[PDB]
């Protein structure tokens, strides 16, 4: 089986040459490996810190076991710095194994708002990265299944024109075999009373209102992790090699006259037991948004003011690790009556005005006058160029005011409770990730999302979370509401927005959607990679993973990342062919 084909001994690759080295066997990494090795003459080696996990059992394969794997060997559990919002560290869950985070994520399959992806081209000047182009790759990746009658009756709606049916990633309705809970339709009824839409297909380009959605699972409910979808079918390809249990530490650079060229990588598990492997064409970094930037820095690609004091020679000076954008999540949970019994998930993609309610006008005044916020974020080291950050913020203001994009997500789980996980989708805060040591294998790094260090992010989160409590005992939801359990006794039930702002910093987690740490945007705008994911000033080196999106999106990110891996893989093959 696949297990027998996987490499584990570094001596099997040490000193060898392949066409492409892919650092990180995760979502983008394995999608890209699969596409590249469709040409039998192209050799690819994937190097993954973890191993194969796709047949472990329910802890991986059943989406309804979500969270059980946290804290195990399959979770990197990256620790943040001591956060300034609450003086505590946080854990950033991240998958460790073939498939990366797809091994451990919630399986939620949705797309952004059209205007968001269009702005990657029209504001961030990435030629060809508009909604229609990226969406065509997204459709190609997708192998969706329409809902059956019982799934529709629960609240599903599937637009056949918005889903590929002949692709690679199996997606369709989560269906545990229970009857579906009426709470999903009650939430829809409760928001309909407020004028909010329901059942819009979150894959069509306007994610707003309360809808169900597809999940990344096979018809038999087995998790569609990236290794099961893109590696397991293809691992017999002799030109596709996978080494497990080793970390990529740094990219090996040589001089090609005036410009450094990536010629390979060093890998290993501790200082003093490292090895080299070489790439004839390119090194492609796909270790995740917390890690790919650090790999550049360890290699001498990063900010001279960060690298020089650590004792690293800055070969290429770029703002690597800046522009980190993760969301904050909080919970509101209630007990339900026995008539609320059954399975189902749904989500409210809530607009700015839906989020703030009566605070909308004041929130808009801040949005109109404070974009000061850019100066503050820069001063905190989340970004280097105040003008370019302001442009990002004007872009979010355009999204909110001229496109009415969703600004928060209130994610409903049922299956015996009514529980919301709630996050502000569009944080203005900008954080960073930087190495704190020269030795890659020590994994000593500062990951600072700067949660709640922008006032609008704290107000918006507070307002969204308060809204979750509000809707839980509104309209049709009153049918099933059997008293709040979280915050419950920890926060008075009539708490106002001010009280919620005081509560939230002590009751949130990372959302685990960190993007931006090797931003795909022009160099003068603060970018690290061009519109073909190439690191500025280096030949044969790309960063291709969730490091690269320059903005957040009103979406779950898998649909975007599979699409982007396909789009970049074609760019790479175009270059190989020429």
Ligand X SMILES: Cc1cc2nc3c(=O)[nH]c(=O)nc-3n(C[C@H](O)[C@H](O)[C@H](O)COP(=O)(O)OP(=O)(O)OC[C@H]3O[C@@H](n4cnc5c(N)ncnc54)[C@H](O)[C@@H]3O)c2cc1C
Ligand Y SMILES: *[C@@H]1O[C@H](CO)[C@@H](O)[C@H](O)[C@H]1NC(C)=O
Ligand Z SMILES: *[C@@H]1O[C@H](CO)[C@@H](O[C@@H]2O[C@H](CO)[C@@H](O[C@@H]3O[C@H](CO)[C@@H](O)[C@H](O)[C@@H]3O)[C@H](O)[C@H]2NC(C)=O)[C@H](O)[C@H]1NC(C)=O
Binding status of residue 507 toward ligand Z by CB under 6 A: no
State the minimum distance, in angstroms, from the CB of residue 458 to ligand X: 23
| Cα-based distances in Å from 3 to 8, 13, 47, 95 | 10, 17, 15, 19
According to the binding rule CB under 6 A, does residue 512 interact with ligand X?
yes
Q: Are 7 and 240 in contact (CB under 8 A)?
A: no
Q: Which is nearer to ligand Y, 367 or 515 (CB)?
A: 367
Q: Which residues pair with 421 in a beta bridge?
A: 331, 411
Q: Around 330, how many Cα atoms within 13 Å sit in the side-chain half-sphere?
A: 28
Give the containing element (helix H, strand E) for 205.
none
Give the angle subtended at the CA of 371 by the CAs of 366 and 377, to the nearest 5°.
115
The bridge status of strand 274-285 relative to strand 541-543 is: parallel
Q: CA-to-CA distance for 20 and 37, rounded, in angstroms?
A: 10
**How many chain residues bind ligand X (CB under 6 A)?**
38
Site for ligand Y in 363-392 (CB under 6 A): 364, 385, 387-388, 391
Q: Binding of ligand Y at residue 204 (CB under 6 A)?
A: yes
Whose Cβ is closer to ligand X: residue 23's or residue 418's? 23
Rounded to a whole number of angstroms, the minimum distance from the CB of residue 527 to ligand X is 17
Q: Among ligand X, ligand Z, ligand Y, none, what does residue 86 contact (CB within 5–8 Å per kind)?
A: ligand Z
In the bound state with ligand Z, the residue whose beta carbon lies nearer, of 38 and 502, is 502
Q: With binding defined as CB under 6 A, does residue 256 bind ligand Y?
A: yes
Nearest C-alpha neighbor of 408 from the set 393, 424, 395: 424
| Span near ligand Z by CB under 6 A; candidates 84-92, 122-130, 348-356, 477-485 | 84-92
Q: How far is the CB of 521 from ligand Y (least distance, A)?
A: 8
CA atoms within 13 A on the CB side of 16: 15
Q: Could you please report the per-residue DSSP string of 302-354?
A: S-HHHHHHHT---SB---TTEEEB--EEEEEEEEE-GGG-SB-EEEEEEEHHH
Lay out the site mask for ligand X across 117-156 (x = CB under 6 A, - = otherwise). ----------------------------------------
Exactly one of 360, 380, 571, 576 binds ligand Y (CB under 6 A); that residue is 360
Nearest Cα residue to 302 out of 528, 117, 116: 528
Q: Which is nearer to ligand Y, 439 or 496 (CB)?
A: 496
Q: To the nearest whole angstrom, how small is the minimum distance from the Cβ of residue 88 to ligand Z?
A: 9
Give 39 or 86: the residue with its C-beta nearer to ligand Z: 86
Residue 485 found at the interface with ligand Z (CB under 6 A): no
Q: Number of residues in contact with ligand Z, rule: CB under 6 A?
A: 3
3-state secondary structure of 199: coil
Residue 104 binds which entry of ligand X, ligand Y, ligand Z, none, CB below 5-8 Å type-dependent: ligand X
Q: What is the DSSP code string of 520-568?
A: BS-GGGT-SB-TT-BBTT-BTEEE-STT--SS--SS-SHHHHHHHHHHH
Please report whether residue 433 would count as binding ligand X according to CB under 6 A: no
Residue 432 parent element (H or E): strand 431-435
Give me the residue label for tokens 């990588």.
265
Coil, strand or helix at 223 = strand
The interface partner of residue 183, options being ligand Y, ligand X, ligand Z, none and the CB cut-off 5 to 8 Å by kind, is none
Annotated catalytic sites, by residue? 513
Q: Does 94 bind ligand X (CB under 6 A)?
A: yes
Smaller CB distance to ligand Y: residue 256 or 498?
Answer: 256
* Stretch touching ligand Z by CB under 6 A, among 25-33, 79-87, 217-225, 429-437: 79-87
Site for ligand X in 252-311 (CB under 6 A): 286-289, 291
* Nearest distance in Å: CB 246, ligand X: 7
The vertex-508 CA angle with 505 and 510, nearest 5°, equals 120
* Shortest distance, position 506 Cβ to ligand Z, whole Å: 9
87 binds, among ligand Z, ligand X, ligand Y, none (CB under 5 to 8 A by kind): ligand Z
Burial class (CB in 10 A: 0-12, 13-18, 19+), 298: buried
Phi and psi, residue 115, nearest 5°: -65, -30
In this complex, which beta carbon is closest to ligand Y, that of residue 289 or of residue 466?
466
Task: Choose the contact partner of 166 out of ligand X, ligand Z, ligand Y, none; CB within 5 to 8 A by kind.
Answer: none
The correct pick among 4, 11, 87, 160 for binding ligand Z (CB under 6 A) is: 87
Residues 214, 415: Cα–Cα separation, whole Å: 17
Name which of 21 and 378 has its Cβ closer to ligand X: 21
* Residue 425 contact partner, candidates ligand Z, ligand X, ligand Y, none, CB within 5 to 8 A by sort of partner: none
CA atoms of 527 and 320, how far apart (whole Å): 8
**Nearest Cα to Cα of residue 516 among 435, 447, 570:** 447
Q: Rounded to an integer, what distance in angstroms lies between the CA atom of residue 293 and that of residue 440?
A: 12
Instruction: Compute CA distances 376 → 154, 196, 385, 392, 434, whole Å.
Output: 46, 35, 11, 14, 19
Q: Is 162 in the site for ligand Y (CB under 6 A)?
A: yes
Q: What is the DSSP string of 289-305?
A: TTTHHHHHHHTTBS-HH
Is 257 a binder of ligand Y (CB under 6 A)? Answer: yes
- Residue 408 binds which entry of ligand Z, ligand X, ligand Y, none, CB below 5-8 Å type-dependent: none
The option from ligand Y, ligand Z, ligand X, none interacting with 545 (CB < 5 to 8 A, set by class) reads ligand X
Residue with Cβ nearer ligand X (48 or 229): 48
Can you tell me which of 108, 211, 414, 429 binds ligand X, judged by CB under 6 A?
A: 108
Binding positions for ligand Z, rule: CB under 6 A: 85-87
Residues forming contacts to ligand Y in the complex (CB under 6 A) are 159, 161-162, 201, 204, 256-257, 259, 261, 353, 360-361, 364, 385, 387-388, 391, 404, 469-470, 473-474, 524-525, 539
Contact residues for ligand X, defined by CB under 6 A:
23-29, 47-50, 93-97, 100-102, 104-108, 247-248, 286-289, 291, 512, 545-546, 556-558, 561
């Amino acid at each position: 089986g696949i297990e027998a084909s996987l490499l584990t001994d570094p001596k099997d690759v040490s000193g060898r040459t392949v066409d492409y080295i892919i650092a990180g066997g995760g979502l983008v990494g394995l999608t890209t490996a699969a596409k590249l090795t469709e040409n039998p003459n192209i050799s690819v080696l994937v190097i993954e810190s973890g191993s194969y996990e796709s047949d472990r059992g329910p802890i991986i394969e059943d989406l309804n076991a979500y969270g059980d794997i946290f804290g195990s060997s399959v979770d990197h559990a990256y620790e943040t710095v001591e956060l300034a919002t609450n003086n505590q560290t946080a854990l950033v869950r991240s998958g460790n194994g073939l498939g990366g985070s797809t091994l451990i994520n919630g399986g939620t399959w949705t797309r952004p708002h059209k205007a968001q992806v269009d702005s990657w081209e029209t504001v961030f000047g990435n030629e060809g990265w508009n909604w229609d182009n990226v969406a065509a790759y997204s459709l190609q990746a997708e192998r969706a299944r329409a809902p059956n009658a019982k799934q529709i009756a629960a609240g599903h709606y599937f637009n056949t024109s918005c889903h590929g049916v002949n692709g690679t990633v199996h997606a369709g309705p989560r269906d545990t075999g229970d009857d579906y809970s009426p709470i999903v339709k009650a939430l829809m009824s409760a928001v309909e009373d407020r004028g909010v839409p329901t059942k819009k297909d979150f894959g069509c380009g306007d994610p707003h209102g309360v809808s169900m959605f597809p999940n990344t699972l096979h018809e038999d409910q087995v998790r569609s992790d990236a290794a099961r979808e893109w590696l397991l079918p293809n691992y017999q390809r002799p030109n596709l090699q996978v080494l497990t249990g080793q970390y990529v530490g740094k990219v090996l650079l040589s001089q090609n006259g005036t410009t450094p060229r990536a010629v390979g990588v060093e890998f290993g598990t501790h200082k003093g037991n490292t090895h080299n492997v070489y790439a004839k064409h390119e090194v492609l970094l796909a270790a995740g948004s917390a890690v790919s930037p650090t790999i550049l820095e360890y290699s001498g690609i990063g900010m001279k003011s960060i690298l020089e004091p650590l004792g690293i020679d800055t070969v290429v000076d770029l703002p690597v690790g800046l522009n980190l954008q993760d969301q904050t999540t909080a919970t509101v949970r209630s007990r339900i009556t026995s008539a609320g019994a059954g399975q189902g998930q749904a989500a409210w993609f809530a607009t700015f005005n839906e989020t703030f309610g009566d605070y909308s006008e004041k929130a808009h005044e801040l949005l109109n006058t404070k974009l000061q916020w850019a100066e503050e974020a820069v001063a905190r080291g989340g970004f280097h160029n105040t003008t370019a950050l302001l442009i990002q913020y004007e872009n979010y203001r355009d999204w909110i005011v001229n496109h009415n994009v969703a600004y928060s997500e209130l994610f409903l789980d049922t299956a015996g409770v009514a529980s919301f996980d709630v996050w502000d989708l569009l944080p203005f805060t900008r954080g960073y990730v930087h190495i704190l040591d020269k030795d890659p294998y020590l994994h000593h790094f500062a990951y600072d999302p700067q949660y709640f260090l922008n006032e609008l992010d704290l107000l918006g989160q507070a307002a969204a979370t308060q809204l979750a409590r509000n809707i839980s005992n509104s309209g049709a939801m009153q049918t099933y509401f059997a008293g709040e359990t979280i915050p419950g006794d920890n926060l008075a039930y009539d708490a106002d927005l001010s009280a919620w702002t005081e509560y939230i910093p002590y009751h949130f987690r990372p959302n685990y959607h960190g993007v931006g740490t090797c931003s795909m945007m022009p160099k003068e705008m603060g970018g690290v990679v061009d519109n073909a994911a190439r690191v500025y000033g280096v030949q044969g080196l790309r960063v291709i993973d969730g490091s690269i999106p320059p903005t957040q999106v009103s979406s779950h990110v898998m649909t975007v990342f599979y699409a982007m891996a396909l789009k970049i893989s074609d760019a790479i093959l175009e270059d190989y062919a020429s």
